[PDB]
Design an enzyme around this catalytic site. Sequence first.
Site, short mmCIF file in Angstrom:
data_model
loop_
_atom_site.label_atom_id
_atom_site.label_comp_id
_atom_site.label_asym_id
_atom_site.label_seq_id
_atom_site.Cartn_x
_atom_site.Cartn_y
_atom_site.Cartn_z
N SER B 146 -25.24 -19.54 -17.41
CA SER B 146 -25.45 -19.15 -18.74
C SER B 146 -24.79 -19.92 -19.82
CB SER B 146 -25.83 -17.78 -18.83
OG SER B 146 -26.69 -17.36 -19.89
N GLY B 147 -25.53 -20.50 -20.76
CA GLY B 147 -25.10 -21.17 -22.15
C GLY B 147 -24.15 -22.35 -22.07
N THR B 151 -30.62 -26.36 -21.29
CA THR B 151 -31.91 -26.41 -22.11
C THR B 151 -31.83 -27.40 -23.03
OG1 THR B 151 -32.72 -24.13 -21.75
CG2 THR B 151 -33.46 -25.18 -23.88
N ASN B 190 -25.51 -16.43 -24.22
CA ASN B 190 -26.16 -17.21 -25.13
C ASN B 190 -27.23 -16.77 -25.95
OD1 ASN B 190 -27.58 -19.72 -25.85
ND2 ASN B 190 -28.32 -20.21 -23.78
N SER B 193 -30.68 -17.92 -25.08
CA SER B 193 -30.88 -17.89 -23.70
C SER B 193 -32.61 -17.94 -23.07
CB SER B 193 -30.43 -16.49 -23.13
OG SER B 193 -30.51 -16.57 -21.71
N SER B 194 -32.59 -19.00 -22.12
CA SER B 194 -33.87 -18.78 -21.69
C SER B 194 -34.06 -17.81 -20.52
CB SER B 194 -34.01 -20.37 -20.97
OG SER B 194 -33.50 -21.31 -21.49
N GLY B 429 -29.52 -19.83 -16.24
CA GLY B 429 -28.34 -20.05 -15.77
C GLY B 429 -27.83 -18.76 -15.03
N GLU B 431 -25.94 -15.71 -14.39
CA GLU B 431 -25.32 -14.79 -15.34
C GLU B 431 -24.94 -13.45 -14.64
OE1 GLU B 431 -28.59 -14.71 -18.20
OE2 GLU B 431 -29.28 -12.64 -17.26
N1 LIG Z 1 -25.14 -30.98 -26.55
C1 LIG Z 1 -25.00 -29.92 -27.30
N2 LIG Z 1 -24.72 -30.35 -28.84
C2 LIG Z 1 -24.81 -29.26 -29.52
N3 LIG Z 1 -25.03 -27.88 -29.20
C3 LIG Z 1 -24.92 -27.59 -27.74
C4 LIG Z 1 -25.18 -28.71 -26.74
N4 LIG Z 1 -25.51 -28.08 -25.79
C5 LIG Z 1 -25.46 -26.87 -26.02
N5 LIG Z 1 -25.28 -26.39 -27.25
C6 LIG Z 1 -25.06 -25.01 -27.85
O1 LIG Z 1 -25.01 -24.07 -26.80
C7 LIG Z 1 -25.99 -22.98 -26.74
C8 LIG Z 1 -26.50 -22.75 -25.21
O2 LIG Z 1 -26.87 -23.98 -24.73
P1 LIG Z 1 -28.17 -23.92 -23.89
O3 LIG Z 1 -28.69 -25.02 -23.40
O4 LIG Z 1 -29.22 -22.79 -24.54
O5 LIG Z 1 -27.69 -23.10 -22.40
P2 LIG Z 1 -28.50 -22.84 -20.95
O6 LIG Z 1 -27.76 -23.76 -20.16
O7 LIG Z 1 -28.31 -21.34 -20.55
O8 LIG Z 1 -29.91 -23.22 -21.27
C9 LIG Z 1 -27.10 -23.58 -27.68
O9 LIG Z 1 -27.91 -22.83 -28.48
C10 LIG Z 1 -26.39 -24.67 -28.38
O10 LIG Z 1 -26.17 -24.02 -29.69
F1 ALF Z 2 -29.06 -18.99 -21.19
AL1 ALF Z 2 -29.41 -20.18 -19.90
F2 ALF Z 2 -30.28 -21.34 -18.81
F3 ALF Z 2 -28.16 -19.55 -18.91
F4 ALF Z 2 -30.85 -20.56 -21.04
MG LIG Z 3 -31.57 -22.46 -21.27
#
Ligand SMILES: Nc1ncnc2c1ncn2[C@@H]1O[C@H](COP(=O)(O)OP(=O)(O)O)[C@@H](O)[C@H]1O
Ligand code: ALF
Ligand SMILES: [Mg+2]
Lengths: 128, 995
Positions: B146-147, B151, B190, B193-194, B429, B431
């Site tokens: 997670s995080g 996404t 996160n 979070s999705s 992710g 968690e």
């Molecule tokens: N390449 C990136 N550039 C800028 N911020 C990022 C990047 N990857 C992740 N983040 C930050 O981390 C947070 C969580 O990433 P996200 O993709 O939502 O997590 P998950 O893997 O759970 O989907 C996002 O809200 C964003 O603020």
């Molecule tokens: F918070 Al996630 F995939 F772990 F969006």
């Molecule tokens: Mg996500």
Amino acid sequence: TEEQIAEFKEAFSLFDKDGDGTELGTVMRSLGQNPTEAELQDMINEVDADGNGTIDFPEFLTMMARKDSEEEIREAFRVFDKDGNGFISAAELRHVMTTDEEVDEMIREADIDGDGQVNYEEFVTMMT
Amino acid sequence: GKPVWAPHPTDGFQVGNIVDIGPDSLTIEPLKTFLALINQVFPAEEDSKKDVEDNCSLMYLNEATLLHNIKVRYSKDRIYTYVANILIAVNPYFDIPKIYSSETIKSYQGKSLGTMPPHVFAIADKAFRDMKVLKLSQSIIVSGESGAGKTENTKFVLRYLTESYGTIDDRIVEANPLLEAFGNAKTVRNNNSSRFGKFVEIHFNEKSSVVGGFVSHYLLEKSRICVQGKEERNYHIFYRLCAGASEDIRERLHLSSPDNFRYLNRGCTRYFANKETDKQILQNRKSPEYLKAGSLKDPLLDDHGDFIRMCTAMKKIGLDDEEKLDLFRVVAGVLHLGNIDFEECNLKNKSTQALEYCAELLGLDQDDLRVSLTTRVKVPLKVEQANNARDALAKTVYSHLFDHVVNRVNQCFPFETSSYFIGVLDIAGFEYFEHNSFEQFCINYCNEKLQQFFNERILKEEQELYQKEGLGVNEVHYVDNQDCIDLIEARLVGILDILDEENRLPQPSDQHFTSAVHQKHKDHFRLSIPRKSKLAIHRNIRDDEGFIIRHFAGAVCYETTQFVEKNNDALHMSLESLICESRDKFIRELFESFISVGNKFKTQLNLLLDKLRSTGASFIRCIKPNLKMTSHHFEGAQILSQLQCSGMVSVLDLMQGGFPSRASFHELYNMYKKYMPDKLARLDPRLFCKALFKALGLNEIDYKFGLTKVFFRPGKFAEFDQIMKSDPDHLAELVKRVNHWLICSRWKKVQWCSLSVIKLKNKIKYRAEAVSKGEELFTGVVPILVELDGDVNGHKFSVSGEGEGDATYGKLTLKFICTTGKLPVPWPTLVTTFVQCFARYPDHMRQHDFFKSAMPEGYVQERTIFFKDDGNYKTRAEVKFEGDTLVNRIELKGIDFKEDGNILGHKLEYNYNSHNVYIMADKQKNGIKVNFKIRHNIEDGSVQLADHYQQNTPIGDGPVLLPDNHYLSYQSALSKDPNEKRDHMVLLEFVTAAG
Ligand SMILES: Nc1ncnc2c1ncn2[C@@H]1O[C@H](COP(=O)(O)OP(=O)(O)O)[C@@H](O)[C@H]1O
Ligand code: ALF
Ligand SMILES: [Mg+2]
Ligand SMILES: [Ca+2]
Ligand SMILES: [Ca+2]
Ligand SMILES: [Ca+2]
């Protein structure tokens, strides 16, 4: 040089017709060089360190070394010349080689000026 | 003794030096001296400042060098790194400038892996090229807890592919604000979070152009709709609506600050905002918590700002204001539903307003709503059951609303027919929290399946390929997680099936279910009772109140309370009817016993697995750098276990000898054959390929021929891509290039061979010359000079010698004078020491004459002479020409001599016997070896034996003769010069060589 050794290694396989890694007489005679059998056993006797008589590539190069090279290249050209006019023909190159079309393709690819034959000044360029 | 990596509790690894080593452990002194086991200690990169783009470029491939390489890159905002064709992506937690620009997108188009720096765009481009060339659909799998940034990277990929290979094309991208509004929510892990899994397909026609797309969505989290933790929120939409809606929309929907809603106020009621966006939100929207503590901070999320962007997105994708308003009306309806309380049951007087607003927004009759939440059908309900009715209605309504949103999104970019797709997988992710329930269980189960697919595709099948092809790549073992998956989805005995059974039996029980799970997997590697937990914060949980699953990403303890209720998707008839018969057309269209949530999920995910198995697959492994959402905080230990659990450490290991690029040899050769002159075509196929690889860079170690496929080592993707390129001109240009090279070889081969014969012939003349020259030095009589210095048991003496040698006769005539007085040894013991180059070698023996062949430069003679039952001599002699005379300088040392022995007590007769000397070649030292025993006569009639050991090596490095075994015959005569006053010996010797 590191290039010249690799070139000799490719030549060494034309000595190593069986492909094992080990004859000198056979090719030396066929390359049209008189010298008989007596001198070959004597010459190999300087690098054969283990006594086996096994001919190995690292031996080959050292066995060729002396304490003049420019005339050796000129003499190599004379091995191609059956008669010795200053040019190598398709029939001349076929003699050292043993398809006829392939020999023609081989002759043409060296001929820089355009005479349909290969002279010394251009025989060197191919070699280096 | 160079510095090494050894374990560190928080950095994962630290630099230090090995001090002492035991059998299984050793000590490390950090660059405090501590214990480490040998197998947790690793070699380090010699340059600690350097970083490589592909971890396969490291000098040493191990988990520690991997960790450090990623660390250094992250230090420079280089968040992407390769392990062959797999990408590791560390969450920056800030926006890196320009790295995702349209200008950057273009720069990655058509470019091979490695020719640009590691990026999500290169993976997306690789998938496109594979799709277009191999005519095979493609899937991009982006994993991570997670995080970690799944996404976000999913978005980068979708953006790449649609900008690059579109021409309405931006709708797949513009869609996300909508899906995130309804499916994303704040979590402790996160902020964005999705709470659902998604698979976004981009479909392509024959020309490899985008024709539309399809979004598959998986299991939206249901409980979040009604309740959340003090630090978490419901889905963003609620807060986006409240923060950003016009005063008009606020009045129509009877919205207020989030604290006013049961479905929001148990969670975090604050908005995501900054100084500038706080002013754009009205006061009547802000909660006491918001006023007290300020906004929530995020670089990406902004509630008010996201509302506008969402509305813009809806307009961009085709949603009219009618549908926008319909969506919002349901959202608020669900909110108002939650504000309905019950007392004994009956609706409380205060919640009258809530019933009115909810019934109106959901197009329902008040009396019908009141009755359906209050009575069961035909008997009345208790307070807690009315709550369960209220919440169940809210969960179904919002769930169906979500289904409708993704369905509405799919209608933006529909396609009649497609040829292939590139799909991007973005699951929720991994968690875990203080309390873990069915939500975490479903999410982590899905995470297990993904890891299994990575294991299946990258670790199992890769090695099966190497072996089937006979490559002899060192096997890499790893712990598989199929058992963990078996535990969950197995028929009859799996947790999901045992759960379904519980829902089926007359009086369902969480604990009866939990007991059954434990009982049916007594000794299982992946299951344990909560009492065996590492933490003590969860030790008071009874055997039937939860279980631990040892997930690939770590053991997670589940409280199994509410598992049964949550596993049932079904809504009761009276609730279903109420909502299906809404006077609102939109709400009726939202709706088109026991329904298993777990087994519906398993079916969906296995159908996804069927999809994935049929595609070429690419992997992006996302890593969370820390737990506090900060930038520039690389937590080595936390990142290390992510690298281990992901399997990336196993993969790096395999790539020590693995081959990420491969092609069918038959297919590759045949596409070049079509352009081969009909001559080159006759050439052995394998030889042609070798020449082709040479022509396009590769050395021999870069590739390997298997039984049917040719394999290429890491870091050679560009070369591979050139080799495989199908373009006629490119295949013709290369065939021409190798054709030329083969002619240049055939020439050089016979050319250099001709030089070879010239040299061989020249060497022969060079040998003969040298041996002739040696031989012509000894034709006539040759003057000799000998000089010896001797030490025998401390007795120092010197002798000078002179005379002549006649090699034709093999005659030596020499006179030796001791210049230092009396000789401390008998002369006869010095005879063999006192120029074998003067030996007679007859006609057919001349080839066996080492001695003459070393001349004029000469040779060194070394002897050890053992006098049996007495001492020994050691001699070194240097024999060479000096003008026309042959000179010999000798040093002699004698030790261990008995002072009253035959030698030092002068008991030898002044005479000498004939002897044969056996010469043989010393091939290694390029000279000769000799062994002989001399017999000296003793006065009383006995014999003193002298055992000789001899070696000759040439002085110069010119050519010499190495002889066949033969012997020299010696006759020796000792005499005295009648006029010589000094101590002396006259020596006459004859030497013939023979067979
Ligand atoms: N390449 C990136 N550039 C800028 N911020 C990022 C990047 N990857 C992740 N983040 C930050 O981390 C947070 C969580 O990433 P996200 O993709 O939502 O997590 P998950 O893997 O759970 O989907 C996002 O809200 C964003 O603020
Ligand atoms: F918070 Al996630 F995939 F772990 F969006
Ligand atoms: Mg996500
Ligand atoms: Ca040998
Ligand atoms: Ca000629
Ligand atoms: Ca010419």
